[PDB]
Coordinates of C-alpha atoms and ligand atoms in Angstrom, one line a residue:
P20 CA -77.6 -116.8 -21.2
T21 CA -75.5 -119.5 -22.7
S22 CA -72.0 -120.0 -24.2
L23 CA -71.8 -118.6 -27.7
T24 CA -68.8 -118.5 -30.1
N25 CA -68.1 -116.0 -32.9
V26 CA -71.6 -114.7 -33.5
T27 CA -71.7 -112.1 -36.3
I28 CA -73.2 -108.8 -35.2
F29 CA -72.3 -107.0 -38.4
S30 CA -70.4 -108.0 -41.6
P31 CA -69.6 -104.9 -43.5
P32 CA -70.1 -104.4 -47.2
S33 CA -67.0 -104.7 -49.3
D34 CA -67.4 -101.1 -50.4
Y35 CA -66.8 -99.8 -46.9
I36 CA -63.3 -98.4 -46.6
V37 CA -60.7 -100.7 -45.0
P38 CA -60.7 -101.4 -42.1
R39 CA -64.5 -101.2 -42.6
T40 CA -65.2 -101.8 -38.9
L41 CA -63.0 -101.2 -35.9
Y42 CA -63.1 -100.4 -32.1
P43 CA -65.9 -102.4 -30.6
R44 CA -67.8 -101.0 -27.6
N45 CA -71.0 -102.3 -25.9
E46 CA -73.3 -101.8 -23.0
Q47 CA -75.8 -103.9 -21.1
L48 CA -78.9 -102.0 -20.1
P49 CA -80.6 -102.7 -16.7
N50 CA -83.2 -104.9 -18.3
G51 CA -80.4 -107.1 -19.6
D52 CA -80.5 -106.0 -23.3
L53 CA -77.1 -105.7 -25.0
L54 CA -76.1 -102.8 -27.3
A55 CA -73.0 -102.8 -29.6
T56 CA -71.3 -100.1 -31.6
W57 CA -68.1 -99.6 -33.5
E58 CA -66.3 -97.3 -35.9
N59 CA -68.2 -97.7 -39.1
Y60 CA -66.1 -96.8 -42.2
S61 CA -69.0 -96.2 -44.7
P62 CA -68.2 -94.2 -47.9
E63 CA -68.8 -90.5 -47.6
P64 CA -70.9 -88.5 -48.1
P65 CA -73.0 -88.7 -46.1
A66 CA -70.9 -88.3 -43.0
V67 CA -70.0 -91.4 -41.0
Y68 CA -72.1 -92.4 -37.9
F69 CA -72.0 -94.8 -35.0
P70 CA -74.5 -97.7 -35.6
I71 CA -76.4 -99.1 -32.5
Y72 CA -77.2 -102.8 -32.7
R73 CA -79.2 -104.6 -30.0
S74 CA -79.6 -108.1 -28.8
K75 CA -82.5 -109.2 -26.7
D76 CA -81.5 -112.9 -26.5
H77 CA -78.2 -112.6 -24.8
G78 CA -76.1 -112.3 -27.9
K79 CA -77.6 -114.9 -30.2
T80 CA -79.2 -112.4 -32.6
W81 CA -78.6 -108.7 -33.4
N82 CA -80.5 -106.0 -35.1
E83 CA -79.8 -102.3 -35.8
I84 CA -82.0 -100.0 -33.8
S85 CA -80.6 -96.5 -34.4
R86 CA -77.6 -94.5 -35.6
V87 CA -75.8 -91.7 -33.8
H88 CA -75.1 -89.0 -36.4
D89 CA -72.8 -85.9 -36.2
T90 CA -75.6 -83.4 -35.8
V91 CA -73.2 -81.0 -33.9
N92 CA -70.4 -80.6 -36.4
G93 CA -71.4 -82.5 -39.5
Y94 CA -67.9 -83.9 -39.8
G95 CA -68.7 -87.5 -39.0
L96 CA -68.8 -89.5 -35.7
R97 CA -65.7 -91.4 -36.8
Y98 CA -63.4 -92.7 -34.1
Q99 CA -63.6 -94.3 -30.7
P100 CA -67.2 -94.5 -29.5
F101 CA -68.1 -95.5 -26.0
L102 CA -71.6 -96.5 -24.6
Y103 CA -72.5 -95.9 -21.0
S104 CA -75.8 -96.4 -19.2
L105 CA -75.8 -94.0 -16.2
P106 CA -75.9 -96.0 -13.0
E107 CA -77.1 -92.9 -11.1
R108 CA -78.6 -89.5 -11.9
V109 CA -76.0 -86.9 -13.0
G110 CA -77.5 -83.4 -12.9
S111 CA -80.7 -83.2 -14.9
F112 CA -80.1 -86.7 -16.5
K113 CA -81.8 -89.6 -14.7
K114 CA -80.3 -93.0 -13.9
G115 CA -80.6 -95.1 -17.0
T116 CA -79.9 -92.2 -19.4
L117 CA -77.8 -93.9 -22.2
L118 CA -74.7 -92.0 -23.2
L119 CA -72.5 -92.2 -26.2
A120 CA -69.1 -90.4 -26.3
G121 CA -67.0 -90.5 -29.4
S122 CA -64.9 -88.4 -31.7
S123 CA -66.2 -86.1 -34.5
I124 CA -63.5 -85.9 -37.1
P125 CA -63.7 -84.5 -40.7
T126 CA -62.8 -86.9 -43.6
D127 CA -59.5 -85.1 -43.9
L128 CA -58.5 -86.1 -40.3
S129 CA -57.7 -82.4 -39.5
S130 CA -59.3 -82.3 -36.0
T131 CA -60.7 -84.3 -33.1
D132 CA -63.7 -83.5 -30.9
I133 CA -64.9 -85.9 -28.2
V134 CA -68.7 -85.2 -28.1
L135 CA -71.4 -86.5 -25.8
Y136 CA -74.8 -87.7 -27.0
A137 CA -77.7 -88.9 -24.8
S138 CA -80.7 -91.2 -25.3
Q139 CA -83.7 -91.3 -22.9
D140 CA -85.3 -94.3 -24.6
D141 CA -82.8 -97.0 -24.4
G142 CA -81.0 -96.1 -27.6
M143 CA -83.8 -95.4 -30.0
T144 CA -83.2 -91.7 -30.3
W145 CA -80.3 -89.4 -29.5
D146 CA -79.6 -85.8 -28.8
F147 CA -76.3 -83.9 -28.6
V148 CA -75.4 -82.8 -25.0
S149 CA -71.9 -81.3 -25.0
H150 CA -68.4 -81.2 -26.3
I151 CA -66.0 -82.9 -23.8
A152 CA -62.6 -82.1 -25.3
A153 CA -61.3 -81.2 -28.7
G154 CA -57.9 -81.3 -30.3
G155 CA -55.8 -81.5 -33.5
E156 CA -55.0 -83.8 -36.4
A157 CA -56.3 -87.4 -36.0
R158 CA -53.1 -89.2 -36.5
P159 CA -50.9 -90.8 -33.7
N160 CA -47.7 -88.9 -34.5
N161 CA -45.7 -87.0 -32.0
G162 CA -46.0 -83.2 -32.2
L163 CA -49.7 -83.4 -33.3
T164 CA -52.4 -82.4 -30.8
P165 CA -55.3 -84.9 -31.1
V166 CA -57.5 -86.2 -28.3
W167 CA -58.7 -89.8 -28.4
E168 CA -60.4 -92.8 -26.8
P169 CA -63.0 -91.7 -24.2
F170 CA -64.0 -93.9 -21.3
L171 CA -66.9 -92.9 -19.1
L172 CA -67.4 -93.7 -15.4
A173 CA -69.9 -92.1 -12.9
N174 CA -69.2 -91.7 -9.2
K175 CA -70.8 -89.6 -6.5
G176 CA -73.2 -87.8 -8.8
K177 CA -70.4 -86.9 -11.3
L178 CA -69.4 -88.2 -14.7
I179 CA -65.7 -88.7 -15.4
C180 CA -64.4 -88.9 -19.0
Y181 CA -60.9 -90.4 -19.2
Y182 CA -59.1 -90.0 -22.6
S183 CA -55.8 -89.9 -24.3
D184 CA -54.3 -86.4 -24.9
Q185 CA -51.6 -85.2 -27.3
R186 CA -52.3 -81.5 -26.7
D187 CA -49.4 -81.0 -24.2
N188 CA -47.1 -81.6 -27.2
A189 CA -44.2 -79.5 -26.0
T190 CA -43.6 -81.9 -23.2
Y191 CA -45.1 -85.3 -23.9
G192 CA -45.7 -87.5 -27.0
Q193 CA -49.0 -88.4 -25.4
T194 CA -50.6 -88.4 -21.9
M195 CA -53.9 -89.7 -20.4
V196 CA -56.2 -87.2 -18.7
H197 CA -59.7 -86.8 -17.5
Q198 CA -62.4 -84.1 -17.1
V199 CA -65.4 -84.2 -14.7
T200 CA -68.9 -82.9 -14.9
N201 CA -71.9 -82.8 -12.5
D202 CA -74.4 -81.9 -15.2
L203 CA -73.1 -83.5 -18.6
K204 CA -72.9 -79.9 -20.0
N205 CA -70.1 -78.1 -18.2
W206 CA -66.8 -79.9 -17.9
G207 CA -64.0 -79.1 -15.4
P208 CA -60.4 -78.6 -16.3
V209 CA -58.2 -81.2 -17.8
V210 CA -56.5 -83.3 -15.1
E211 CA -53.3 -85.1 -16.0
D212 CA -53.5 -88.8 -14.9
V213 CA -50.6 -90.5 -16.6
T214 CA -47.5 -88.6 -17.7
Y215 CA -43.9 -89.8 -18.2
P216 CA -40.7 -87.9 -18.3
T217 CA -39.4 -89.4 -21.6
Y218 CA -40.9 -87.5 -24.6
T219 CA -41.3 -90.5 -26.8
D220 CA -43.4 -92.3 -24.2
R221 CA -47.0 -92.6 -25.3
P222 CA -49.2 -94.1 -22.6
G223 CA -52.7 -94.5 -24.0
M224 CA -56.1 -96.1 -24.1
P225 CA -57.5 -95.9 -20.5
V226 CA -60.0 -98.4 -19.3
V227 CA -61.3 -98.6 -15.7
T228 CA -63.1 -101.1 -13.6
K229 CA -64.2 -100.8 -10.0
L230 CA -63.1 -103.6 -7.6
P231 CA -65.2 -104.9 -4.7
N232 CA -62.9 -103.3 -2.1
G233 CA -63.4 -99.8 -3.5
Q234 CA -60.2 -99.7 -5.4
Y235 CA -60.4 -98.7 -9.1
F236 CA -58.3 -100.7 -11.6
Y237 CA -57.0 -98.3 -14.3
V238 CA -55.4 -100.1 -17.2
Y239 CA -53.6 -98.7 -20.2
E240 CA -51.0 -99.5 -22.9
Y241 CA -47.7 -98.0 -22.0
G242 CA -45.9 -97.1 -25.3
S243 CA -42.2 -96.7 -24.7
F244 CA -38.7 -97.6 -25.9
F245 CA -37.9 -98.4 -22.3
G246 CA -34.4 -97.2 -23.1
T247 CA -33.9 -99.6 -26.0
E248 CA -34.1 -99.3 -29.7
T249 CA -37.5 -101.1 -30.0
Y250 CA -40.9 -99.6 -29.1
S251 CA -43.5 -101.7 -27.4
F252 CA -47.0 -101.2 -25.8
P253 CA -47.1 -103.5 -22.6
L254 CA -50.1 -103.3 -20.5
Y255 CA -49.8 -101.4 -17.2
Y256 CA -52.3 -100.6 -14.5
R257 CA -52.7 -98.2 -11.6
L258 CA -54.8 -98.7 -8.5
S259 CA -56.5 -95.9 -6.6
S260 CA -59.6 -95.7 -4.3
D261 CA -60.2 -92.2 -5.7
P262 CA -61.1 -92.5 -9.4
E263 CA -60.1 -88.8 -9.9
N264 CA -56.6 -89.3 -8.5
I265 CA -54.6 -91.5 -10.8
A266 CA -51.3 -89.5 -11.1
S267 CA -50.2 -90.4 -7.5
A268 CA -50.4 -94.1 -8.1
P269 CA -47.2 -95.8 -9.5
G270 CA -47.7 -97.8 -12.6
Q271 CA -47.5 -101.6 -12.3
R272 CA -46.6 -103.8 -15.4
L273 CA -49.1 -106.6 -15.8
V274 CA -47.1 -109.9 -15.5
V275 CA -48.5 -113.2 -16.8
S276 CA -47.5 -116.4 -15.1
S277 CA -46.9 -118.1 -18.5
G278 CA -44.5 -115.4 -19.7
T279 CA -46.8 -114.0 -22.3
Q280 CA -46.2 -110.2 -22.5
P281 CA -49.6 -108.7 -23.5
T282 CA -49.5 -105.6 -25.6
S283 CA -51.8 -102.8 -26.9
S284 CA -55.3 -101.6 -26.3
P285 CA -56.4 -103.2 -23.1
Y286 CA -59.9 -103.8 -21.7
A287 CA -60.6 -104.7 -18.1
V288 CA -63.7 -105.9 -16.2
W289 CA -64.5 -107.6 -12.9
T290 CA -66.9 -110.4 -12.0
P291 CA -67.9 -111.7 -8.6
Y292 CA -67.3 -115.2 -10.0
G293 CA -64.1 -117.2 -9.3
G294 CA -63.3 -116.6 -5.7
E295 CA -63.9 -114.4 -2.6
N296 CA -62.4 -111.4 -4.4
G297 CA -64.0 -112.2 -7.7
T298 CA -61.9 -112.1 -10.9
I299 CA -60.5 -109.2 -12.9
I300 CA -60.4 -110.2 -16.6
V301 CA -58.2 -108.3 -19.1
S302 CA -57.9 -108.4 -22.9
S303 CA -55.1 -106.9 -25.0
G304 CA -55.3 -106.0 -28.7
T305 CA -52.6 -108.5 -29.7
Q306 CA -53.5 -111.8 -27.9
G307 CA -56.5 -113.9 -28.5
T308 CA -56.4 -115.4 -24.9
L309 CA -57.6 -113.6 -21.8
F310 CA -55.7 -112.7 -18.6
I311 CA -57.3 -113.2 -15.2
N312 CA -56.5 -112.2 -11.6
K313 CA -58.4 -113.5 -8.5
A314 CA -56.4 -111.4 -6.1
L315 CA -57.4 -107.8 -7.0
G316 CA -54.4 -107.3 -9.2
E317 CA -51.8 -108.9 -6.8
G318 CA -49.2 -111.4 -8.0
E319 CA -49.2 -112.7 -11.6
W320 CA -52.1 -113.1 -14.0
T321 CA -53.3 -116.4 -15.4
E322 CA -53.6 -116.7 -19.2
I323 CA -56.7 -118.6 -20.2
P324 CA -58.1 -119.7 -23.6
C325 CA -60.8 -117.6 -25.4
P326 CA -62.9 -118.6 -28.4
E327 CA -63.2 -115.1 -29.7
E328 CA -60.5 -113.9 -32.2
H329 CA -58.0 -111.3 -31.2
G330 CA -58.7 -107.8 -32.2
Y331 CA -57.9 -104.1 -31.6
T332 CA -59.3 -102.8 -28.3
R333 CA -61.4 -106.0 -28.0
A334 CA -64.2 -105.2 -25.6
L335 CA -65.2 -107.2 -22.5
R336 CA -68.4 -107.1 -20.5
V337 CA -69.5 -109.1 -17.4
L338 CA -73.2 -109.5 -17.9
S339 CA -75.4 -109.1 -14.8
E340 CA -77.3 -112.3 -15.1
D341 CA -76.8 -115.0 -12.5
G342 CA -74.7 -112.5 -10.5
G343 CA -72.0 -112.0 -13.1
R344 CA -71.7 -115.5 -14.6
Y345 CA -71.3 -114.7 -18.3
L346 CA -68.6 -112.8 -20.1
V347 CA -69.0 -111.0 -23.5
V348 CA -65.9 -110.8 -25.6
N349 CA -66.6 -108.5 -28.6
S350 CA -64.2 -107.8 -31.5
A351 CA -64.6 -105.4 -34.5
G352 CA -61.4 -106.5 -36.3
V353 CA -57.7 -105.5 -36.5
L354 CA -56.1 -102.2 -37.5
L355 CA -56.1 -101.9 -41.3
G356 CA -57.8 -105.2 -41.6
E357 CA -58.9 -106.5 -45.0
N358 CA -61.6 -108.8 -43.6
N359 CA -62.9 -107.2 -40.5
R360 CA -66.3 -107.9 -39.0
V361 CA -68.0 -107.3 -35.7
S362 CA -68.5 -110.5 -33.7
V363 CA -69.1 -111.6 -30.2
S364 CA -68.6 -114.7 -28.0
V365 CA -70.1 -115.4 -24.5
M366 CA -68.2 -117.4 -22.0
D367 CA -69.5 -119.2 -18.9
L368 CA -67.4 -118.0 -16.1
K369 CA -68.8 -120.8 -13.8
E370 CA -66.7 -123.2 -16.0
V371 CA -63.8 -121.2 -17.4
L372 CA -62.5 -119.5 -14.3
Ligands
LIG417 O1 -59.5 -95.7 -33.4 C1 -59.0 -95.4 -34.7 C2 -57.4 -95.5 -34.7 O2 -57.0 -94.3 -33.8 C3 -55.7 -93.9 -34.2 O3 -54.7 -94.3 -33.3 C4 -54.8 -93.5 -32.1 C5 -53.7 -94.1 -31.2 O4 -54.1 -95.4 -30.7 C6 -53.6 -95.7 -29.4 O5 -52.4 -96.6 -29.7 C7 -53.1 -94.3 -28.9 O6 -53.5 -94.1 -27.5 C8 -53.6 -93.3 -29.9 O7 -52.6 -92.2 -30.1 C9 -55.4 -94.6 -35.6 O8 -54.8 -93.7 -36.5 C10 -56.8 -95.1 -36.0 O9 -56.7 -96.3 -36.9

């Protein structure tokens, strides 16, 4: 791999509906290949789908290889995809099964349904596996009951899906929860992970990375007034050595040594590079810079430059090559953006950390 800046993965046609693209996610397969997807706002009919683009040259070039269509509901695979190569067998699904979770939503935004698709051929073909969780109207307004934003993580022969939940609307504006499965087909009950006692609080957008000492770093945006007249979405994290037990961990506000106060739509990864504990690397949806921590989340975070533009839920990935040396930074644009595109940069962590 090499450093790359602002490589275009996909530039949408003008006749796509603003924002055209949004919500980048990616995966690196064990052979090193990179896959990228996003919310793809094509005119309907036919129903929207999640495109799957591949790079076999470490991000220099990209080609579409498949599309994940809404074969289960016919509504459209519309919001909040997530790619995940199983690192171990789960039930009848071998290590290396490639999963996509994402939300099936009709054009009228009347419902949400986080569904799970699987590919056994590295993303060439897909089959529906199960519904994870379904809810109400796909708008982020209090009183509504949607589900949103799946994040997948396997541990001990199980798959965990973390997501944002508005269904407990009598008590919370939004929470974050998870469900667990040992077979990809049958899901256990909803477990509340992050709840707050002020109704107008809206924690959201969970992303997890495992640290080398066995702790899990669970990052989220914490929407709140914090007792003022102004709402904000500062980044918070929780630390737990049990990835199914988040509720018992107190939230910790991410503090940056420069004074930047990062907000919205976090992403977190970990590399062995940078020191004896490696480095946690965090993005927000508002800042173009990155935030790093060489002490497992202790102390304050260091803001560093980044050549990739800022974007909503900008996605990070530490590539495996050279023991975690290169970082993918992948944007699909901004909310309601008039000129969104899907792009990627690669940074050399040997130099930038
Ligand atoms: O991904 C498309 C995007 O989702 C909807 O917002 C959901 C909202 O986003 C986070 O801030 C919260 O966790 C969740 O409630 C938008 O309407 C749509 O553009």
